[PDB]
Design an enzyme around this catalytic site. Structure first.
Site, PDB file in Angstrom:
ATOM      1  N   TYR A   1       0.828  -1.176  -0.191  1.00 13.53           N
ATOM      2  CA  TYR A   1       0.118  -0.010  -0.054  1.00 13.53           C
ATOM      3  C   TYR A   1       0.888   1.426  -0.002  1.00 13.53           C
ATOM      4  O   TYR A   1       1.915   1.394   0.634  1.00 13.53           O
ATOM      5  CB  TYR A   1      -0.928   0.157   1.217  1.00 13.53           C
TER       6      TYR A   1
ATOM      7  N   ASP B   1       1.711  -8.392  -0.191  1.00 11.94           N
ATOM      8  CA  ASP B   1       0.438  -8.117   0.126  1.00 11.94           C
ATOM      9  C   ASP B   1      -0.341  -6.896  -0.575  1.00 11.94           C
ATOM     10  O   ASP B   1       0.293  -5.800  -0.402  1.00 11.94           O
ATOM     11  CB  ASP B   1       0.343  -7.877   1.435  1.00 11.94           C
TER      12      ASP B   1
ATOM     13  N   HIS C   1     -11.372  -8.120   3.392  1.00 13.41           N
ATOM     14  CA  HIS C   1     -10.444  -6.677   3.856  1.00 13.41           C
ATOM     15  C   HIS C   1     -10.967  -6.466   5.293  1.00 13.41           C
ATOM     16  O   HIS C   1     -10.191  -5.915   6.139  1.00 13.41           O
ATOM     17  CB  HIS C   1     -10.618  -5.695   2.683  1.00 13.41           C
TER      18      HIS C   1
HETATM   19  N1  LIG Z   1      -5.601  -5.348   6.169  1.00 11.33           N
HETATM   20  C1  LIG Z   1      -5.671  -4.169   6.246  1.00 11.33           C
HETATM   21  O1  LIG Z   1      -6.774  -3.379   6.636  1.00 11.33           O
HETATM   22  C2  LIG Z   1      -4.317  -3.319   6.139  1.00 11.33           C
HETATM   23  C3  LIG Z   1      -4.078  -1.896   6.843  1.00 11.33           C
HETATM   24  C4  LIG Z   1      -2.791  -1.464   6.974  1.00 11.33           C
HETATM   25  C5  LIG Z   1      -1.724  -2.292   6.289  1.00 11.33           C
HETATM   26  N2  LIG Z   1      -2.090  -3.476   5.500  1.00 11.33           N
HETATM   27  C6  LIG Z   1      -1.016  -4.019   4.848  1.00 11.33           C
HETATM   28  O2  LIG Z   1       0.281  -3.874   5.778  1.00 11.33           O
HETATM   29  C7  LIG Z   1       1.265  -3.234   4.790  1.00 11.33           C
HETATM   30  C8  LIG Z   1       1.945  -2.671   5.800  1.00 11.33           C
HETATM   31  O3  LIG Z   1       1.576  -1.933   6.893  1.00 11.33           O
HETATM   32  P1  LIG Z   1       1.563  -0.228   6.686  1.00 11.33           P
HETATM   33  O4  LIG Z   1       1.471   0.336   5.177  1.00 11.33           O
HETATM   34  O5  LIG Z   1       1.045   0.265   7.960  1.00 11.33           O
HETATM   35  O6  LIG Z   1       3.198  -0.021   7.043  1.00 11.33           O
HETATM   36  P2  LIG Z   1       4.525  -0.596   8.025  1.00 11.33           P
HETATM   37  O7  LIG Z   1       4.909  -1.680   7.615  1.00 11.33           O
HETATM   38  O8  LIG Z   1       4.031  -0.061   9.575  1.00 11.33           O
HETATM   39  O9  LIG Z   1       5.623   0.801   7.508  1.00 11.33           O
HETATM   40  C9  LIG Z   1       5.588   2.005   8.062  1.00 11.33           C
HETATM   41  C10 LIG Z   1       6.695   2.920   7.383  1.00 11.33           C
HETATM   42  O10 LIG Z   1       8.053   2.145   7.920  1.00 11.33           O
HETATM   43  C11 LIG Z   1       8.904   2.661   7.046  1.00 11.33           C
HETATM   44  N3  LIG Z   1       9.882   1.522   7.019  1.00 11.33           N
HETATM   45  C12 LIG Z   1       9.735   0.327   6.283  1.00 11.33           C
HETATM   46  N4  LIG Z   1      11.019  -0.432   6.854  1.00 11.33           N
HETATM   47  C13 LIG Z   1      11.628   0.537   7.573  1.00 11.33           C
HETATM   48  C14 LIG Z   1      13.020   0.287   8.109  1.00 11.33           C
HETATM   49  N5  LIG Z   1      13.742  -0.661   7.709  1.00 11.33           N
HETATM   50  N6  LIG Z   1      13.388   1.203   8.764  1.00 11.33           N
HETATM   51  C15 LIG Z   1      12.724   2.512   9.049  1.00 11.33           C
HETATM   52  N7  LIG Z   1      11.515   2.547   8.398  1.00 11.33           N
HETATM   53  C16 LIG Z   1      10.956   1.694   7.845  1.00 11.33           C
HETATM   54  C17 LIG Z   1       8.203   2.571   5.858  1.00 11.33           C
HETATM   55  O11 LIG Z   1       8.349   3.997   5.291  1.00 11.33           O
HETATM   56  P3  LIG Z   1       9.622   3.915   3.574  1.00 11.33           P
HETATM   57  O12 LIG Z   1       8.510   3.564   2.425  1.00 11.33           O
HETATM   58  O13 LIG Z   1       9.872   5.345   3.484  1.00 11.33           O
HETATM   59  O14 LIG Z   1      10.641   2.950   3.829  1.00 11.33           O
HETATM   60  C18 LIG Z   1       6.764   2.567   5.944  1.00 11.33           C
HETATM   61  O15 LIG Z   1       5.880   3.699   5.569  1.00 11.33           O
HETATM   62  C19 LIG Z   1       0.541  -2.470   4.009  1.00 11.33           C
HETATM   63  O16 LIG Z   1       1.271  -1.738   2.974  1.00 11.33           O
HETATM   64  C20 LIG Z   1      -0.593  -3.198   3.427  1.00 11.33           C
HETATM   65  O17 LIG Z   1       0.167  -4.269   2.644  1.00 11.33           O
HETATM   66  C21 LIG Z   1      -3.064  -4.001   5.572  1.00 11.33           C
HETATM   67  C1  LIG Z   2      -9.209  -0.314  10.793  1.00 13.71           C
HETATM   68  C2  LIG Z   2      -8.966  -0.434   9.214  1.00 13.71           C
HETATM   69  C3  LIG Z   2     -10.350  -1.066   8.745  1.00 13.71           C
HETATM   70  C4  LIG Z   2     -10.514  -1.345   7.433  1.00 13.71           C
HETATM   71  C5  LIG Z   2      -9.314  -1.118   6.867  1.00 13.71           C
HETATM   72 CL1  LIG Z   2      -9.719  -1.469   5.085  1.00 13.71          CL
HETATM   73  C6  LIG Z   2      -7.928  -0.657   6.796  1.00 13.71           C
HETATM   74  N1  LIG Z   2      -7.126  -0.723   5.991  1.00 13.71           N
HETATM   75  C7  LIG Z   2      -6.579   0.414   5.354  1.00 13.71           C
HETATM   76  C8  LIG Z   2      -7.145   1.923   5.512  1.00 13.71           C
HETATM   77  C9  LIG Z   2      -6.655   2.735   5.068  1.00 13.71           C
HETATM   78  C10 LIG Z   2      -5.573   2.789   3.929  1.00 13.71           C
HETATM   79  C11 LIG Z   2      -4.801   1.602   3.893  1.00 13.71           C
HETATM   80  C12 LIG Z   2      -5.444   0.465   4.542  1.00 13.71           C
HETATM   81  C13 LIG Z   2      -4.788  -1.036   4.074  1.00 13.71           C
HETATM   82  O1  LIG Z   2      -5.291  -2.138   3.987  1.00 13.71           O
HETATM   83  O2  LIG Z   2      -3.447  -1.122   3.954  1.00 13.71           O
HETATM   84  C14 LIG Z   2      -7.881  -0.640   8.296  1.00 13.71           C
HETATM   85 CL2  LIG Z   2      -6.301   0.280   8.707  1.00 13.71          CL
END
Ligand SMILES: NC(=O)c1ccc[n+]([C@@H]2O[C@H](COP(=O)([O-])OP(=O)(O)OC[C@H]3O[C@@H](n4cnc5c(N)ncnc54)[C@H](OP(=O)(O)O)[C@@H]3O)[C@@H](O)[C@H]2O)c1
Ligand SMILES: Cc1ccc(Cl)c(Nc2ccccc2C(=O)O)c1Cl
Length: 303
Positions: free
Chosen positions: A19, A45, A112
């Site tokens: 994302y 993912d 999701h």
């Molecule tokens: N199921 C859902 O509803 C849901 C919700 C949230 C996220 N997700 C999935 O989970 C993935 C990851 O979660 P997230 O997007 O919240 O981000 P995350 O994994 O918590 O990363 C947050 C920030 O960490 C930085 N980062 C990465 N590696 C690092 C390192 N080695 N040192 C310092 N900073 C670092 C990145 O910035 P840079 O890009 O500048 O490195 C990133 O923006 C999403 O991309 C998506 O695929 C799913």
């Molecule tokens: C609490 C909650 C509830 C529903 C979704 Cl879809 C998400 N997921 C996202 C919300 C905003 C931006 C990105 C996401 C994600 O799936 O990465 C979260 Cl963090």
């Protein structure tokens, strides 16, 4: 390495988060997904929501075509968006994600979110959504199926469903040292359901859902002190913490140095005292904290 899911398929325990907010051009997803795979990531993912499946799919096909990996070496996840919970919409939403990525199947398809949205909130029996997900695994569209953002009660509703055919293999949820989900993790282990951690590095802190006054996980002093002790970085400590808890962890990075850094999670380990120190950071803090979720009848954190 990989964890064996409860349907016999295997999931790589470190995944690449794709994302990026809409201000990042769509072409970046293609480039960094290639870099992640080059670095050693094998679990990728994505979601209909992310508006990047064409790019992410192209990166995967690109790395198959140039010979670095085979399709069966890649574990690719997509997710059913919350306007498609009505059962008749599930399979078409999946086939669409497939056509975007140009893949024949996803390794994993997730609901999701439990918060249904009108095809404005909606009321849907997620047990019927689930049946439709089961049919997708039966058809070979998804090797495995699972949920995301489900709390214990919501997960129980599926597990207790009359004539359930497949348990969810996982529940992908917000999870990191400030919101470590210990009780939910124990419940999932008791059911052989994998917990997959997102925002394990403290989230992208997007102002649309995250308060910028919230503590910055990667400046945590306990995480900084363990990174110093291990001579690694706060991010590496936060990822290793999940692996040692039996949690599959995602890590988003659109930066080439950090993408390569993150696979170092396999190169060291934390002691019991380190793990206790991290466990003691838990403070019931979910970064996504927005009126847009909080008012939903099926908000997972209504707790
Ligand atoms: N199921 C859902 O509803 C849901 C919700 C949230 C996220 N997700 C999935 O989970 C993935 C990851 O979660 P997230 O997007 O919240 O981000 P995350 O994994 O918590 O990363 C947050 C920030 O960490 C930085 N980062 C990465 N590696 C690092 C390192 N080695 N040192 C310092 N900073 C670092 C990145 O910035 P840079 O890009 O500048 O490195 C990133 O923006 C999403 O991309 C998506 O695929 C799913
Ligand atoms: C609490 C909650 C509830 C529903 C979704 Cl879809 C998400 N997921 C996202 C919300 C905003 C931006 C990105 C996401 C994600 O799936 O990465 C979260 Cl963090």
């Amino acid at each position: 390495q990989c964890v064996k899911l409860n349907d016999g398929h295997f999931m790589p325990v470190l995944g690449f988060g794709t994302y990026a907010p809409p201000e990042v051009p769509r072409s970046k997803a293609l480039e960094v997904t290639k870099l992640a795979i080059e670095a050693g990531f094998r679990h990728i993912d994505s979601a209909h929501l992310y508006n990047n499946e064409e790019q992410v799919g192209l990166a995967i096909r690109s790395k198959i075509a140039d010979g670095s990996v085979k399709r069966e070496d890649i574990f690719y996840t997509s997710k059913l968006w919350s306007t498609f919970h009505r059962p008749e919409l599930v399979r078409p939403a999946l086939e669409n994600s497939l056509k975007k990525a140009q893949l024949d199947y996803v390794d994993l398809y997730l609901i999701h979110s439990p918060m249904s949205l009108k095809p404005i909130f909606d009321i849907v029996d997620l047990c019927t959504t689930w049946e439709a997900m089961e049919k997708c695994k039966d058809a070979g569209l998804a090797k495995s199926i699972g949920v995301s953002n489900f709390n214990r009660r919501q997960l129980e509703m599926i597990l207790n469903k009359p004539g359930l055919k497949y348990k969810p293999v996982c529940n992908q949820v917000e999870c990191h040292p400030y919101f470590n989900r210990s009780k939910l993790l124990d419940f999932c282990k008791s059911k052989d359901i994998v917990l997959v951690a997102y925002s394990a590095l403290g989230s992208q802190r997007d102002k649309r859902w995250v308060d910028p006054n919230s503590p910055v996980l990667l400046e945590d002093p306990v995480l900084c002190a363990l990174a110093k002790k291990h001579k690694r970085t706060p991010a590496l400590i936060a990822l290793r913490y999940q692996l040692q808890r039996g949690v599959v962890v995602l890590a988003k990075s659109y930066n080439e140095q950090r993408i390569r850094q993150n696979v170092q999670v396999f190169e060291f380990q934390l002691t019991a005292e380190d793990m206790k120190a991290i466990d003691g950071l838990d403070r019931n803090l979910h970064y996504f904290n927005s009126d847009s979720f909080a008012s939903h009848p099926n908000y997972p954190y209504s707790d």
